[PDB]
Design an enzyme around this catalytic site. Structure first.
Site, PDB file in Angstrom:
ATOM      1  N   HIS A  71      10.924  -4.515  12.451  1.00 39.62           N
ATOM      2  CA  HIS A  71      10.793  -3.580  13.516  1.00 39.62           C
ATOM      3  C   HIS A  71      11.617  -3.998  14.663  1.00 39.62           C
ATOM      4  CE1 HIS A  71       9.253  -0.207  15.738  1.00 39.62           C
ATOM      5  NE2 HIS A  71       9.123   0.349  14.711  1.00 39.62           N
ATOM      6  N   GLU A 126       5.706   1.211   0.394  1.00 42.72           N
ATOM      7  CA  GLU A 126       6.385  -0.184   1.321  1.00 42.72           C
ATOM      8  C   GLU A 126       5.578  -1.266   1.123  1.00 42.72           C
ATOM      9  OE1 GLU A 126       7.341   0.131   5.877  1.00 42.72           O
ATOM     10  OE2 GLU A 126       6.189  -1.616   5.504  1.00 42.72           O
ATOM     11  N   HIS A 174       0.762  -1.239   0.110  1.00 40.01           N
ATOM     12  CA  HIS A 174       0.134   0.043  -0.079  1.00 40.01           C
ATOM     13  C   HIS A 174       0.994   1.394  -0.004  1.00 40.01           C
ATOM     14  CE1 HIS A 174       0.810   0.815   4.421  1.00 40.01           C
ATOM     15  NE2 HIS A 174       0.798  -0.818   4.208  1.00 40.01           N
TER      16      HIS A 174
END
Length: 90
Positions: free
Chosen positions: A86, A58, A47
């Site tokens: 992350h 990304e 998206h």
């Protein structure tokens, strides 16, 4: 077709995944899926970003890995930005 470019922060991202568990050819291989955007994980689905910067999107080739990049139709090239996780990066 569109070439494949790399950034600075990107080069410092793969080095962290290659040690934990990653492949080199994987990137040059996933490119075919990045240009078409077929998989990107059904639950994830690539998206845009929006918010002043429309030229930024990304995706997530892996079930636990992102991939920020920017296309440049000016010369048909695929310039990557970020890649990893992350929890991995941090």
């Amino acid at each position: 077709m569109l070439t494949i470019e790399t950034s600075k922060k990107f080069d410092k991202d793969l080095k962290i995944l290659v040690k934990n568990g990653f492949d080199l050819k994987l990137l040059y291989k996933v490119v075919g899926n990045l240009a078409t955007e077929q998989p990107l994980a059904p639950k994830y689905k690539d998206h845009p970003l929006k918010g002043g910067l429309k030229d930024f999107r990304e995706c997530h080739l892996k079930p636990d890995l992102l991939l920020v990049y920017q296309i440049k139709k000016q010369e048909n090239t695929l310039f990557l930005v970020r890649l990893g996780s992350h929890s991995e990066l941090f």
